[model samples]
Target: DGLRHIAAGRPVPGSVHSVSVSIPDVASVIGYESNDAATLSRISWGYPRFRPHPYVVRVAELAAREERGALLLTRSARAARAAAAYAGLPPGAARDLTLGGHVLSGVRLPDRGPGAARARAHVMHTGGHLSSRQAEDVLWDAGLIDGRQVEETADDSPARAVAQALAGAYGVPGPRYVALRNSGMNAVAAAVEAVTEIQRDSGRRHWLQLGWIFFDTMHLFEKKVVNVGHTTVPDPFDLAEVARVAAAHAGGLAGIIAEIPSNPGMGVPDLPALREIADRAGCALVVDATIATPHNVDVVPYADVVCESLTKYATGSADVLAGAVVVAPGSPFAADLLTVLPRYGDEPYRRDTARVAARIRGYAERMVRVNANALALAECLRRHPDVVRDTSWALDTRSAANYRKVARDSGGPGGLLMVDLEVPLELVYDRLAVAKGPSFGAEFTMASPQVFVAHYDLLTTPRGRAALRARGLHRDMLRVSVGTEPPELIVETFERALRP
Candidate 1:
């Protein structure tokens, strides 16, 4: 019922109490006006639970410098028009303005009008029954309503140049980035798909992925791509095990992918050793070097290709979204991936690329601070009984020793780490005052319930829960991404919560 209510454009009530909704902009930002947008203007201010309840405001579609206006939210066209003429905007002229907090837009009259002046006001502040991320989603949806286009293909040119700079930052030679992708998985999708298309030979129809890794990436390699079965070899990456798997299915492995200093579990795999494995198997080695940015680790030496989510430490703000797949000059497949990228690629919008490059300007500096904080927290957690059990960071595993082999002069422990405290999760969660959300590689400290965000479905089932447990991972791991916030503040904040 709650879902049905939302689908019908009504609020969720009685049940599922905090559900939210978005009424999108039906127009374009650069072109002007949502000419035929179906506005929520007619919906009563308070009809659907606690609505945005748009009230009356003045408006006018100006063609020149002298147009006057009307009310917008009234089902009568509104918003005083003189205000627009004063601004001297182009036709379908800019009449909308966000007053107090209401988004006022619409030119056709009775359609709406503000109540008589001296009218009482009603309002809301956030801190409502909504989550921050949800609020963000709704906000983006509305931006769509007004013809605000943020996604782009043309803007991708700058985005790719920025990507090239990033690849160089990582020390990859003559870096050739795979076609841009919308997400990390799509980055791999293009690589694997392209590899599959060319290798239709009976000689190799399999790919080998290593250890426990990100969920979507894992799902994609092993199950999503068709006719291409895959084996997830052990993570601390046992040479014997890798060889046995390869020997068992000789001439069948097409590619290999793994993360450097991985997520949640934090196993810092030995890239050089893994490269040897891929070489011997005659398969491509793909390294995900996002966490251990080129600023810290030199991964290009041992792999055929490298992928990174530029959205993280590279972009840092936590707003822009992007991924890059850089090809190694010597990889037999390097020339092949170039031709396939644009044919199966995703590009960043101009707005996102602009922010990404701006963010990159500060990455080296930001990660220095972030890396230091992460190490500091790990030091603190080492002895804290509440958080020491099954805790993991890049330096905490047997494979951690591998980090020193390729670590750049500047890299230290990275920004991510996880802990499953002894205390009830809820007890500690509500007490955490730092940012709580998914993602890492930002300029401010943030934390989130990883299991809740990434593995809720798997943990909900007995079999799935058991599988994760066997891998030494938990369904309640809290991922903390240290950032460039004030060092003393970062330490003080966690120390207060943990020792409290």
Candidate 2:
């Protein structure tokens, strides 16, 4: 019976072919080589029909081949040590050298023996400092191996990595990028430079003015151009007229610059149609996407230069300070910004850029999840009955149309929103349970009345009151910035806070 079972259904001497024992044996043979091979083989053997056969020999052959290949490729600790010493660096130093750009602290190699040889090896390993493969491109470019090159090291060389990361974070493709000096003030200066470059590239000689409250106030001492009638509200009812006025007041239509979901007030401009108007006038369109964030709106496609405060939502912890300007690849403005950054930008800022890069890399996943939570909470508040009005254009459908047209598809509504209650603005502010502050994008939720905080006395100024009236900003307007807490919790908290 055993003999018959073993040879069942084969080309036997005297019987009709029924079941083949060889098929089961073949399966058993493959099972022996898999991770759970022993368990699989026992199960197979338990089946009476496939106990043992010649097909098992073939499975055994395949398993042996795979095991041999794996053993041959396996690397050992000693080999890793040798590869590390060859660069005259400790394991950590060698890693940093090969993957990033950190300045070497001290030499660890032999004084005379093979010094020249090691130098050449370092160059070969690093692929030359200037030619080092960017971390993002290392996988695609096979010539770059991790921990092999000194200048291409990981920890020290974060400029390229940070630049690439920012691009990816904001959903902009590479081949063209921009960096900013460390401070918020420098960021504003860089924005001005970006505008100048845009004008230069388009072969237009025009005077451009950046509209900043601080800049306008400090103008006489700083020797910069100042416009007397400039207001934060750029007459949204007639954007074309506003642009025309600003252009005539300044000089030519090189560009119109403003923050959508702007800082301090969360004011949003009509970006898409504004871009169209700028283009028609042979001018570049630019927006400070820092506050709006690519998460809330992607401004790269519509904007000539998209600037961001990397210190904010991009590095949600608020531990580091850095800013970035993302210029579209092959954009006329990119070259100038890159050229000016290293030469003219502040020195201490580079360190902040590096720190921000590391933090962003470490916390990206958690930050995105929390920011999404904030957005969801804000959307719920938009439908709340007690909420009389909302200034965050991105929250409403009409405002989202321009956002959708300009921003990339992967981006989402950002973490900041402003809502107005029908009650007196001061009473509503007092009723809120959260901290009221000037900053918008923080890890914790905050609320403020924009008209009182940003334009309190400005309304008395002839131009300020006119601007407020034109833009429909009432005295009772309240702005809210959502944070990373659970949406349900945020909504519940708001509901409880607003009960009157």
Candidate 3:
């Protein structure tokens, strides 16, 4: 209701506790991405990584006091050591201690300067760190933090509670094989780690990416993976290419990771066919359904492990961050994943689970509106004169059939609408009155300059721009996350923005 206020930097949902930092306009978006000191100075809180929550930073500061070096908080000593090794640090640098009935791990590097900065980036890119909630718990246990926002009490079994809720929604069996995680990226990290370990003995040291996946997920493969190689089939609909790559790398292929409807471009792959290819290659198929939530699409039967960001629709309010890794009971890799997933992923903090439980109560009901509203917006934009392209799964002819293969009859592509404009992107973006920020699946509508925000480095370089064009992504496209607002009003807002 107060979108303009949010655009003017109202910490989305108007809470000091909110995780999203409004980008406001195209220039601000560029400023944020370019790490402009003036733009960063105005931001008190921002989307994680770019600006981690204060509580999270506080915990790291408190933990690093003794070591007097840059630090990373992890869920366990094993994760700490793994993160340290990935950061090129010695095993002795990793340490662990008990706090609030849980073991917290920390990796403190000897250098607190650029060396530490590089190490921190390496670990963060790997998605191996404690969540904000975990950090809060650590502070709370030490009697160093207190607030009304922390009132959400711990459940008897928080992870199990979230798992049960998610399992039921996905129609998978209860809690047994579902592992809750700190973020969607962490969930991917866990699944990749488990699959790589299980396949290592068989000489399988390669992973295949079915499409141009989320930015950080791609980094996980390119950066975090050690002694392993990975390949990408940019075109999601190119079955021939996928088969060719799989057959070529079959000898060392360990797993394949694909987004149900690939981000920015919204290309849906033929999961069933991919499953057959994975079977032939003797590799596990990991599918991320973050965009097409379980409430909308069903990928369980085909995917060996299904990963989703519970921070999205599950926590509908966008106040909490969480993710889930569900091992498909029928998959050949299920048993092994169940045994190793916990070792890799950080468990959801008790308070965060309680918050998710509260938000997810209306999850199914919310997706119904989200799906319908997104389809309506996609149709409206497709017919608009200023819009040159619309990439929502519902209207994207190239991937519509593939999307329907997994979409529930009641669900129309879930709330992601990507469109390229005939006019200048900066002009339209600055004129829009909506929340302009990162992350999606919240109750409030948000419009982000997709490539500019996600791949600004690419947008600014000729070679990078060429690479994006090859993947069919326009540098000026806007990725709108449709909320539960009335379709007529949402379309009206966009119509006004696209005016000539």
lDDT of 2 by residue, 455-490 (tens): 556544678877766655666666666666666767
lDDT of 1 by residue, 190-213 (tens): 566666655556477787777777
The model with the greatest lDDT is 3
Error of 2 at 379 (Å): 4.5
TM-score of each: 0.68, 0.57, 0.93
Q: Give the TM-score of candidate 3.
A: 0.93
The full ranking of all candidates by lDDT, starting with the best, is 3, 1, 2
Off by over 4 Å in 3: 67-69, 97-104, 110-118, 137-146, 150-156
Model 2 lDDT at residue 183: 37
* RMSD of candidate 1 to true structure, Å: 15.5
**Each prediction's Cα lDDT score?**
0.56, 0.46, 0.77
Error of 2 at 408 (Å): 3.5
lDDT of 3 by residue, 281-316 (tens): 999999999988998888999999999988787777
